[PDB]
Design a protein around this ligand. Structure first.
Ligand SMILES: *CC(=O)Nc1ccc(NC(=O)C*)cc1
Lengths: 516, 86, 16
């Protein structure tokens, strides 16, 4: 104990740098026994001398004896105090810029211990610039070193925007992504995924991760045995999916996500459906690729299995919406839904107790399926037309009670705007009217007045679909009569000069049929 | 938005009616293709959904001399054939 | 020519 400690304390402080060498070495050997390290801890003078010399020396051997000394010091509650109250954290952060592996290991391990058991260490490391120093070290190769560094970032970034934005500004995203491409050590991959999940919550970090290629990199590990790694990757993947639907090199990720739809785990199904929904939203190539690997079949089975679970059906129906329009394989996808017995279940999602978002998505899917003539009669035989009229009527009559002459009080119900329901339902009935039997069913429900009303609507695309469905009806003589009787001549004429030239096309088409 | 870059075959026929760029949206391709057929007036007036393009470039770019406007999937297939998505 | 443009507009509606 206090026998050689004062004299060793008085030798780390010495203007001769040789003297501080053999000092530091014998203080290192000293720090290895509980009796001899207790005392260094209880001596405030010894601790800052170690820290001060560690941080200022240029000789290497002393720099890792001191660093190793503090590392031996960090295994005790009261050794973490002494390091803390002696300004060790700023010193340890400085040594993260050292070009010697031995010192680097001691410095990052002591910091790791302080961050884990010493309160106030999170803040101190942040003030000293520890995050920037740690992100820079992520280009090292030693697997165990990376795991300690990434866990330290996990500790500092959890629920702290400043730390996440600093990691973002320091170039953390691509480094964490590159670790996921390169390594197979589970413990490092899991820790790295924990940091990426934390960063993916902050929407500012999403483009950086995506751009680095984190989608493809995290998808690499959805076959990994460790399930804590998989669901961390899946969670992060779902959080990240709305940003960038413009990514190439996604063939393997998309194929794996379709396979994961058949998972025994039900939250894996939910995440996989939500990711596929976002990845298919605007992307021509992702659509062709999901279909090519049997995505339509898997998503239809996902909907059947889901029942009334709207956390599953809503994303799965949305994914099926995207895949049945505006790509080369849309005509297949429309048929595949019917051939895998999807038409009945798609229609009852229209009825209660579905909420408006699922109903809106289902209406949009039905509109796409109606583009296939083989679906016209089966959709009719499933009762789709009267249910679409039910939703259209309820949504239109809801807009009316909010329209007056100051416009319409724009509002949302369960995240949806009723105008969207009017738009999709009349659009769905527009495509369904291409079949003669459907037209008989449509008019049979006294809908011609309802559609005539929608011509005066101030929404552009509602004029689109209202004029469009009245067109199809008019190509039957006995229809064409009933529409003139309601008073369609006047508004249709002013629609003939619409910025939406498609509106003028149907408008003239109706006028040709009525009075010839 | 889906941007496409038409094959030189189809690019003549677009610029045949005053197209500008080398990439378009499907809306523009469908507009100019539509404008073309109405300028050439390739459609039969008895049933104006039939389009004979016997010795017109359209038949040369599509294949066959006489489709109908309402055979939608056959037309889009021929359209896709002359396109490269971006 | 209205009959033809209306048929062409049914065509183009599949890309909406
Ligand atoms: C979808 C579709 O093909 N509609 C349609 C509308 C009108 C006509 N022709 C006339 O009205 C004269 C054809 C097709």
């Amino acid at each position: 104990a206090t026998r050689a400690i004062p004299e060793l304390t008085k030798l780390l402080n010495d203007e001769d740098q040789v003297v501080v060498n053999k000092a530091a070495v014998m203080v290192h050997q000293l720090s290895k026994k509980e009796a001899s390290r207790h005392a260094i801890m209880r001596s405030p003078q010894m601790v800052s001398a170690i820290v001060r010399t560690m941080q200022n020396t240029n000789d290497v051997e002393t720099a890792r004896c001191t660093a190793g000394t503090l590392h031996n010091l960090s295994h005790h509650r009261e050794g973490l105090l002494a390091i803390f109250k002696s300004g060790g954290i700023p010193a340890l952060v400085k040594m993260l810029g050292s070009p010697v592996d031995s010192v680097l290991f001691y410095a990052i391990t002591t910091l790791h211990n302080l961050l884990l058991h010493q309160e106030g260490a999170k803040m101190a490391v942040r003030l000293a610039g520890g995050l920037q120093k740690m992100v820079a070290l992520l280009n090292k190769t030693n697997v165990k070193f990376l795991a300690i560094t990434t866990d330290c970032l996990q500790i500092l970034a959890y629920g702290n925007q400043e730390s996440k934005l600093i990691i973002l500004a320091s170039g953390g995203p691509q480094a964490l992504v590159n670790i996921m491409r390169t390594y197979t050590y589970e413990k490092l991959l899991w820790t790295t995924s924990r940091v990426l999940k934390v960063l993916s919550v902050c929407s500012s970090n999403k483009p950086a991760i995506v751009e680095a290629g984190g989608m493809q990199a995290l998808g690499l590990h959805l076959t990994d045995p460790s399930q804590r790694l998989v669901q961390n990757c899946l969670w992060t993947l779902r959080n990240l999916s709305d940003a960038a639907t413009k990514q190439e090199g996604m063939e393997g990720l998309l194929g794996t996500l379709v396979q994961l739809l058949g998972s025994d785990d039900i939250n894996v199904v939910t995440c996989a459906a939500g990711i596929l929904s976002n990845l298919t939203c605007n992307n021509y190539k992702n659509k062709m690729m999901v279909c090519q690997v049997g995505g339509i079949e898997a998503l239809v089975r996902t909907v059947l299995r889901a029942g009334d679970r709207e956390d599953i059906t809503e994303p799965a129906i949305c994914a099926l919406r995207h895949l049945t329009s505006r790509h080369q394989e849309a005509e297949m996808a429309q048929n595949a839904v019917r051939l895998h017995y999807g038409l009945p279940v798609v229609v009852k999602l229209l009825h209660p107790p579905s909420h408006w978002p699922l109903i809106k998505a289902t209406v949009g899917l039905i509109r796409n399926l109606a583009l296939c003539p083989a679906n016209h009669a089966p959709l009719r035989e499933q009762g789709a037309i009267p249910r679409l009229v039910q939703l259209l009527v309820r949504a239109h009559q809801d807009t009316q009670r909010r329209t007056s002459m100051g416009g319409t009080q724009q509002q949302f119900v369960e995240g949806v705007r009723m105008e969207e329901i009017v738009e999709g339902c009349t659009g769905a009935l527009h495509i369904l009217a291409r079949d003669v039997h459907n037209r008989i069913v449509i008019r049979g429900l006294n809908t011609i007045p309802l559609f005539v009303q929608l011509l005066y609507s101030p929404i552009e695309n509602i004029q689109r679909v209202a004029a469009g469905v009245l067109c199809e009806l008019a190509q039957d003589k006995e229809a064409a009569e009933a529409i003139e009787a309601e008073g369609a001549t006047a508004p249709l004429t002013e629609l003939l000069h619409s910025r939406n030239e498609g509106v003028a096309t149907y408008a003239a088409a109706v006028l040709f049929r009525m009075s010839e | 938005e889906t941007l496409v870059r038409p094959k030189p075959l189809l690019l003549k026929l677009l610029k045949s009616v005053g197209a500008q760029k080398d990439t378009y949206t499907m809306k523009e391709v469908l507009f100019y293709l539509g404008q073309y057929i109405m300028t050439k007036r390739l459609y039969d007036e008895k049933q104006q959904h039939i389009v004979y393009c016997s010795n017109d470039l359209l038949g040369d770019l599509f294949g066959v001399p006489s489709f109908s406007v309402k055979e939608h999937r056959k037309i889009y297939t021929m359209i896709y054939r002359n396109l490269v998505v971006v | 020519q209205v009959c033809y443009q209306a048929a062409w507009q049914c065509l183009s509606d599949d890309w909406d």
